[PDB]
Amino acid sequence: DWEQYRDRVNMLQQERIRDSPLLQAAKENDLRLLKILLLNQSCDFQQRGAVGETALHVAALYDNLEAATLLMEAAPELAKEPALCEPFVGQTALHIAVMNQNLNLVRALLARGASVSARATGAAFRRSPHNLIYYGEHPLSFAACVGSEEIVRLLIEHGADIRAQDSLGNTVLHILILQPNKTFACQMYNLLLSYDEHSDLQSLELVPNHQGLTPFKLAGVEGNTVMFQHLMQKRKHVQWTCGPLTSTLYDLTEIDSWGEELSFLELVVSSKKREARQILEQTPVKELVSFKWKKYGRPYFCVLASLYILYMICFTTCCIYRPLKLRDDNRTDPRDITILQQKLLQEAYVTHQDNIRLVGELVTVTGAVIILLLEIPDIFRVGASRYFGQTILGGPFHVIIITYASLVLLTMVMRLTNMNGEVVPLSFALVLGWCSVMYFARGFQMLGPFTIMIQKMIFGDLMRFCWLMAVVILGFASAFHITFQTEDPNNLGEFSDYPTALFSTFELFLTIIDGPANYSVDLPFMYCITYAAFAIIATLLMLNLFIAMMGDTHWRVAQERDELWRAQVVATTVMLERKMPRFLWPRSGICGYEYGLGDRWFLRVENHHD
Amino acid sequence: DWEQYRDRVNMLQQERIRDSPLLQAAKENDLRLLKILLLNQSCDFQQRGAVGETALHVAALYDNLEAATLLMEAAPELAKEPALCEPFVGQTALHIAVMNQNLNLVRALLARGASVSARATGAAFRRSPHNLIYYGEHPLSFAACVGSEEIVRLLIEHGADIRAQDSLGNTVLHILILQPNKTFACQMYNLLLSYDEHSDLQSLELVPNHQGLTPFKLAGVEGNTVMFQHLMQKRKHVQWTCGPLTSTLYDLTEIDSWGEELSFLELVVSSKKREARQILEQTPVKELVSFKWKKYGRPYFCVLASLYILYMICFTTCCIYRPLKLRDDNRTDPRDITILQQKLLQEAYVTHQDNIRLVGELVTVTGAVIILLLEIPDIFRVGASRYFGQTILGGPFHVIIITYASLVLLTMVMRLTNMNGEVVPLSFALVLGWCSVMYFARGFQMLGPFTIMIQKMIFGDLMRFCWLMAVVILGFASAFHITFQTEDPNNLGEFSDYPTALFSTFELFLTIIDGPANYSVDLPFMYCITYAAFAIIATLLMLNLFIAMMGDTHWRVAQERDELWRAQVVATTVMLERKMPRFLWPRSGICGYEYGLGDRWFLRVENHHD
Ligand SMILES: CC(C)[C@@H](C)/C=C/[C@@H](C)[C@H]1CC[C@H]2C3=CC=C4C[C@@H](O)CC[C@]4(C)[C@H]3CC[C@]12C
Ligand SMILES: CC(C)[C@@H](C)/C=C/[C@@H](C)[C@H]1CC[C@H]2C3=CC=C4C[C@@H](O)CC[C@]4(C)[C@H]3CC[C@]12C
Ligand SMILES: CC(C)[C@@H](C)/C=C/[C@@H](C)[C@H]1CC[C@H]2C3=CC=C4C[C@@H](O)CC[C@]4(C)[C@H]3CC[C@]12C
Ligand SMILES: CC(C)[C@@H](C)/C=C/[C@@H](C)[C@H]1CC[C@H]2C3=CC=C4C[C@@H](O)CC[C@]4(C)[C@H]3CC[C@]12C
């Protein structure tokens, strides 16, 4: 929760420990004062602290086995007392004794009758970035997550339910997977699977949490590669081993996820963790997505890319041959250079070429409607921020594709209603529609990690550098405008108006226009000093600083090009499996039923070991 | 072959193993059930699997020595039974027993009379990228490639022919060289040479395969540097060793390859493997090509470069002084600026300077004919794709040189036929002919690894980045054309026509022209927003991204500059040895016959060891 509230809670807990002499003796392991208190019978033994902790909780917290046994000899009901305050509600002495790995204290508490199924629904025991650890809500979950196998065996022998869930629905396998240390996690997973004598019901592995994730899916989502390898070791079958050639037969019941709302690969790719992209490098998943991409994903993606390119060619040809007529009125203003205008709806669609344009425009409108019908339910199937905010699963390409379809439909509306100004949505749709073709650059290895470079340059570096650049533009444009306020605009009109001054200074920042010079006339002397300062500071230092930032970003992406391209391949394959019809996408892998191996589907992997 | 077919074959093989109780007992090493089957006499013992494998093949496949001896005690004819299906045709139990290194099983099979010359012509035993290994087609080849020397000795003692070839003609030395692991390969090569008691016939080393490669040539082609060093250890003679100076005398019978169609160095350089360029760094080859390049290659290459430069000077001077006359007709169109045209064949070649031009044009046509006569039979001596598609042996320089000669001859044809439009082939030939002079940059160390940088930037990076760049050009050119469709073209004519809009936006992408600005008139407001987006996205992000890609490509080539330059030196020296007359290229090395060492030719290497 709040850091200040937890600090006040800890300070109040230490204050109530230091104020109470029984709690002070329990903390400091003062056996004489504690025995004088307990042998004495002032009739008080349940003094609670600031968090509602008993004296047994204080004895277990500071590793005081002798003081805890003294507190359990007299009035042993403290072995069945949880805390009664917000940051530690539900925590007993058994939880602290398990977390401190005091095995004799856990033995003594289970001898005195500790609650082995004590569900600690505390604020500090929830999975949150405020808490440093998430060990669970049960003593068995705590003992499995800490790493003491003997305490796990002791709690199981006393009757701790392995199939117990948290507030998030997580069983002990989920919280065991969620731990960062993974050396002992595989052995603890083996121990908890070995103690599943129940085996009735479904196996603990098939138990989903409240998010609907199995432990296999949670190992996929969180990027736990070691637990993923340990899980696939239990689901593989070595067919044969001849010399150095080992042929094994992995099971694809959970990896492929046939007939499910969210497949395993979709959950792996659409994950906020950076370590989830290493699951695609693992042994069954890499061969599975390579088979899917090489057999079905690449030809279908190339066909869709060719259709989209021809569609954009038709839209561009309809933009070029747009119906325009001569201007009716006279150009009274000498600075106005508009000689054509848009024809009316009655004036257009007359000749044969206009009917060809009508056919192409119907093709364009139908394609935009098809685009909207393909993209709109994906914003409601998952979250809008998740669908619009991930690099791997398209992302900004979907936003500009939906914007392109919306602008094409708006152009159609303005065409049918005889509204002037189709140049703005047609230019927007021509820029956005052609730039969306780079989405289909993710289907090729050489060009795919380039769109990721451009994405991590625009939203990565350009959105940070544009504030300093805009500050320099807003300074020097105002300076250049006020130096040329008392000047004739016919000789040097690059700073005549302040919007034009902003645009001209932006161009001079990017060095795409020449410096404003008119040597036939006498420019003001302040312009030369201001432009020398602009050339030193803006065009030389900051522009090449942005060039170096883009170079470092390109190097950072190019050091991990194949991983990002494989992630894009899996994202594209998942999207094509979800959206295309099922008869064009047969089920991947060996059928297995024709070979007598049941209804499961397998992937055969032949490797060259030693 | 196909991955799905091999997967179906393996699944069917495991299905037929699991269905048959004899094969199941042979796989699982169930001695009791197997003895009940064999001691029983249901009169069946040759049940074949899905691949035609016997029960002895299943026993040898899963390392079941006891089950294999039980299957060989009753009906031992299974020791002489190969498989009878496509992926394993010709494979016996001896092959699997050798590959599994079960020495007692190989002893038992040779005791029962296994076929020691069993030629396994299977689909899985062929050298292909589908197969993970290529161990050969014979049990001796399998035992030499796996690494068990005792099984090699056992097979040789029973009469396995060492001089046996595969479907590719490869003997056991070729397949032993083709293995990736090279520590045991030298010892196995020594063992197989030591067992060549035949020594009649030619030595196994001089036995070529179906591609015509000796094991020395195959070690050169595949880049096996360790086997190359081991082969040159057997062909060197240490003349003396005084202090730290060791003078040895390498033999150049196979490295130089006098009087052969394909020399050793040509096969090393024209190799698809990247590791073949390390053969040129080895001890005799480096000194040999350095002697050849320093004595003969560099002066002849500099003479040819000077002749080609003077030839291009003559061609350029004939292009500058091209016969042109005043235009006969009148310039009716105000946008037409053509004032000259080409003179007729009768009108030209009149004055003295025209006769000097005629002499130069005859020189140019003769040089192009000489160029075609030098380059045309090289396209038929080797493959066309091999000759036109390798960086080291010229490659694109040969294509542009042949194109230059073809365009010069086409210009001559258009000159003789009075056909208008010599400017197109003359401009093409002037661009391509002068750019071919960079071919002669490969003869100098400092400038040579620069043409490789440009080649790996054009075909490496430019051919990948040009699709995204063309996408941005096709978007923004159409946007800029439709914003200036309803505008007067006299004020801003950079986007008047769509081809001119494409060209102007390509120039604005490369920042070689200024931004289109006409401050005397009022430009449309959409142009400013579209050009600000073009300046942000195209000229700033993508152009400098391509700059960073070229920087990384230049760094990648510059980290290996000397290796690539030495490869180009060997390629140039091989080309000059092949194409120049023999009297200008004396045989390299010590003659040897005058010193009583036979007809062989030697290279003396003096090195400073310790
Ligand atoms: C038309 C003008 C007014 C302005 C709006 C135009 C903006 C275009 C050029 C910009 C806006 C956002 C840009 C953009 C958004 C995000 C991505 C995803 C990235 O992975 C590749 C580049 C890509 C695809 C680029 C392409 C160019 C876009 C679409
Ligand atoms: C430096 C960063 C922030 C980049 C991205 C922004 C550039 C700014 C300065 C650019 C982007 C688009 C430009 C722009 C849009 C359109 C017009 C209308 C035109 O008739 C006058 C110039 C004017 C008013 C300019 C002003 C400067 C703008 C707003
Ligand atoms: C004349 C115009 C129309 C066009 C066709 C001209 C193209 C020229 C400039 C281009 C085409 C291909 C280019 C090219 C091909 C390949 C190589 C081999 C490389 O190792 C060095 C650069 C070099 C030699 C370059 C030189 C420049 C060339 C020849
Ligand atoms: C971005 C990459 C793909 C680079 C290599 C390609 C550039 C394209 C856009 C260039 C290359 C040559 C250019 C070109 C060739 C010749 C002409 C004829 C001229 O009268 C009008 C422009 C026009 C029609 C332009 C159009 C744009 C072209 C085709």
Swiss-Prot record, chains A, B:
The keyword Aminoacyl-tRNA synthetase belongs to this UniProt entry's keyword annotation: no
Catalytic reactions on record: Ca(2+)(in) = Ca(2+)(out)
The keyword Phosphoprotein is assigned to this record: yes
Alphabetic keyword roster: ANK repeat, Calcium, Calcium channel, Calcium transport, Calmodulin-binding, Cell membrane, Glycoprotein, Ion channel, Ion transport, Membrane, Metal-binding, Phosphoprotein, Repeat, Transmembrane, Transmembrane helix, Transport
Region named Interaction with S100A10: 570-574
A Gene Ontology BP annotation from the UniProt entry: calcium ion homeostasis
Functional description taken from the UniProt entry: Constitutively active calcium selective cation channel thought to be involved in Ca(2+) reabsorption in kidney and intestine. Required for normal Ca(2+) reabsorption in the kidney distal convoluted tubules. The channel is activated by low internal calcium level and the current exhibits an inward rectification. A Ca(2+)-dependent feedback regulation includes fast channel inactivation and slow current decay. Heteromeric assembly with TRPV6 seems to modify channel properties. TRPV5-TRPV6 heteromultimeric concatemers exhibit voltage-dependent gating.
The protein's name: Transient receptor potential cation channel subfamily V member 5
Species annotation: Oryctolagus cuniculus
Lineage: Eukaryota, Metazoa, Chordata, Craniata, Vertebrata
Protein encoded by which gene: Trpv5
Full-sequence range covered: 28 to 638 of 730
